[PDB]
Design a binder for this molecule. Structure first.
Ligand SMILES: CC(=O)N[C@@H]1[C@@H](O)[C@H](O)[C@@H](CO)O[C@H]1O
Ligand SMILES: *[C@@H]1O[C@H](CO)[C@@H](O)[C@H](O)[C@H]1NC(C)=O
Lengths: 48, 28, 88
């Protein structure tokens, strides 16, 4: 139990570090926002 | 929330309303 | 010039509708227009006095209506989307 708890806490800490060290870790979300912005930007570049 | 990135208002300038989500991020 | 009112401005050749407000945009001493990533007119230098005015498109938005079933009541609330409280 002690070893599992230590491994669990360490793995959670690495999750924090992995998401911090890797901002792209959230590419699947950021791409979604980018696609929406691109579509909206394209939709505004049509009135020019 | 700090790893995901006014511009949406710039499209709002031309008839493009952006409705807010029903479940606010705090309630989510 | 009148600020904080939706007007049909015609600064030089540029025409357009919107509310115009004093801004802190530091135009270079030669620039006239204002623009953004959307390539839309954002601000404007006042031609006859060198002041900076950003152009917010004056408020629009959907008008949603909050209603229970007609058989329940005919009372109605309305929701002006994307706008503050202006005309009621
Ligand atoms: C963007 C803007 O100026 N619109 C106002 C906002 O400042 C104010 O906070 C809100 C009530 O809280 O009413 C609206
Ligand atoms: C130009 O004329 C306008 C209107 O009389 C005046 O407000 C302004 O001070 C004059 N000088 C400039 C800045 O061109």
């Amino acid at each position: 139990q002690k070893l599992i708890a230590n491994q669990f806490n360490s793995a959670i800490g690495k999750i924090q570090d992995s998401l911090s060290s890797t901002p792209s870790a959230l590419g699947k979300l950021q791409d979604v926002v980018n696609q929406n912005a691109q579509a909206l930007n394209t939709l505004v570049k049509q009135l020019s | 929330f700090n790893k995901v990135t006014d511009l949406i208002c710039a499209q709002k300038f031309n008839g493009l309303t952006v409705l807010p989500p029903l479940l606010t991020d705090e309630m989510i | 010039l009148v600020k904080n009112k939706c007007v049909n401005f015609n600064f030089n050749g540029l025409t357009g509708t919107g509310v115009l407000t004093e801004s802190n945009k530091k135009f270079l001493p030669f620039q006239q227009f204002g623009r953004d990533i959307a390539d839309t007119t954002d601000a404007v230098r006042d031609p006859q006095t060198l002041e900076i005015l950003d152009i917010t498109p004056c408020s629009f938005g959907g008008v949603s209506v909050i209603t229970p079933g007609t058989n329940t009541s005919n009372q109605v609330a309305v929701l002006y989307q994307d706008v503050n409280c202006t005309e009621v």
